[PDB]
């Protein structure tokens, strides 16, 4: 259907494309963060939060994609096709996955308000000229 | 990580293994069932339930896999590899997807109690050898 | 008819006469800013604000100008004339559109008072010669 | 942004498509009307009405387009391209413009109710076959 993975949380794809795709960390970094910070809660038998629910489902989908890529590397013979499939996965699906993981982890960590203000401000910043914007890029911090 | 997509709700992959893989409907059937019963709630900007939160993500994963299948059929010149990939997707990932869709649509339509009692009773029925197995299997119903 | 697009809002062309050309983001940047912050309201059936009204009208004007530029590229056979017209559009009309979009977005974001005080101070700064002004311009930011 | 310039006022492009293109008066006539009736209010420093705001923006866009046409006739030497650009501007853009100006002037002058009723009634008239189409086409009047 026409489902937006962020609108039940108060965001939208138009608001997360408002940031560059070269901004979002790697899938490995984000999954390591998720583990480190919320493993006991994602492996828990509790609806701890919708963020946790969505994050579980996304981690499962990524695991199945990795299984697919390994199965490809094993079975498929044409290296061209194999590399092409694996690259498509890791690039397009990786970008989507890490936008979503960033959103969820960062909301869990800072706040929906904080994260949305950050999106707005960082987009406006990277769109503003340097001479008239602050010189240092915005960054989220618990400290 | 080791995430079970059901223990958040009160089930396990071992409890749903009571049902064989030849049991679950097709993805078309289940997505149509969802579009019939819960479309407006899935397209809604509300955490109506964890079942919705999870079913949305599952539907998005499936949409991305279908997009992948089309992109493959287009951008791959080895029909053998193309067919292999599409078949793997639609078979393995479809089986998992429809396990999950079945669980969610059922616990949304009937409830945890009914669904788990159904799984137990169907395990009884299907572990029972056929000489003593009634024909009237357990069939979820509001009637 | 001797109309000023800001007099209705409490400003003047002579007040924004000082902001340079290098101060305003690109048209794409500003239109994306709008689409991300106020799309649900601009596409709304409500007079949410005079800023919204003006901003809708400006967006439509720019759309018709882009349509013109495309029609030119398609229906003119003198590359010189085509390039000259498209350049004029994107440069002069783009500058005016940037000025206006900036004013409206900035007011909606910060406030009429804040924006007008920023304009006063920025004029004070840009009228001073560099030998006597601070080197870093004033800054309007949410951060 | 998919914006409808009449949706914030209570109309649509499908409701105004009832009226043909050869129905709307000339830009000269409509701007003369606007002057005569609302010059002091359009030149005013007040959000007198959303119609006034929109009308100001439209007049400004038309002025910039006329400036473009003049700049063209001056700089551009290729008569073919010059005439093509000028005629495109006038015909098509002025069609859009006189739609908009008609709507706003008419609403300001008569009423939202009167204008929407006029649109539906002119639809009735123009859909009626000629054998039963009265020659006294509908017309807006305060008498
Ligand atoms: C191939 O079938 C074997 C049986 O699978 C059951 C055991 O695995 C548990 C199911 O786990 C998942 C994992 C991922 C998914 C999602 C929602 C991510 C969808 C999918 C399969 C499209 C990737 C669903 C169920
Ligand atoms: C190539 O990247 C383009 C950027 O598109 C991002 C916006 O598109 C919306 C899609 O949103 C998502 C995000 C994540 C996902 C999940 C979590 C289901 C995982 C994925 C990408 C592995 C299928 C699906 C859709
Ligand atoms: C060529 O005309 C075909 C008619 O198509 C109808 C389209 O829907 C109506 C859109 O109405 C307008 C009216 C004015 C305008 C602006 C304000 C941009 C003015 C213009 C035409 C001077 C650029 C834009 C759209
Ligand atoms: C060439 O740029 C110079 C800077 O502008 C100096 C005058 O500024 C006044 C702004 O005037 C306008 C006029 C029209 C417009 C509209 C909204 C009609 C848009 C446009 C420029 C696309 C025609 C915007 C601003």
Swiss-Prot record, chains A, B, C, D:
Changing residue 80 to I: In strain: Latvia. Coiled coil: none annotated. One of its GO terms (molecular function) is structural molecule activity. Keywords: Capsid protein, Cytoplasmic inwards viral transport, DNA-binding, Host cytoplasm, Host-virus interaction, Microtubular inwards viral transport, Phosphoprotein, Repeat, RNA-binding, T=4 icosahedral capsid protein, Viral penetration into host nucleus, Virion, Virus entry into host cell. The keyword DNA-binding applies. One of its GO terms (biological process) is viral penetration into host nucleus. GO terms for cellular component: host cell; host cell cytoplasm; T=4 icosahedral viral capsid. Phosphorylated by host SRPK1, SRPK2, and maybe protein kinase C or GAPDH. Phosphorylation is critical for pregenomic RNA packaging. Protein kinase C phosphorylation is stimulated by HBx protein and may play a role in transport of the viral genome to the nucleus at the late step during the viral replication cycle. Belongs to the orthohepadnavirus core antigen family. Homodimerizes, then multimerizes. Interacts with cytosol exposed regions of viral L glycoprotein present in the reticulum-to-Golgi compartment. Interacts with human FLNB. Phosphorylated form interacts with host importin alpha; this interaction depends on the exposure of the NLS, which itself depends upon genome maturation and/or phosphorylation of the capsid protein. Interacts with host NUP153. This is Capsid protein. The chain holds residues 1 to 143 of 183 of the full protein.
């Amino acid at each position: 259907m026409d489902i937006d993975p962020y609108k039940e949380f108060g965001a939208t794809v138009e608001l997360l494309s408002f940031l560059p795709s070269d901004f979002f960390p790697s899938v490995r970094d984000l999954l390591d963060t998720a583990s480190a910070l919320y493993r006991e809660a994602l492996e828990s038998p509790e609806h701890c939060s919708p963020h946790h629910t969505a994050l579980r489902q996304a981690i499962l989908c990524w695991g199945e994609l990795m299984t697919l890529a390994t199965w490809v590397g094993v079975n498929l013979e044409d290296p061209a096709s194999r590399d092409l499939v694996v690259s498509y996965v890791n690039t397009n699906m990786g970008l989507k996955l890490r936008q979503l993981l960033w959103f969820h982890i960062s909301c869990l960590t800072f706040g929906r308000e904080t994260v949305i203000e950050y999106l707005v401000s960082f987009g406006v910043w990277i769109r503003t000229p340097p001479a008239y914007r602050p010189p240092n890029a915005p960054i989220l911090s618990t400290l």
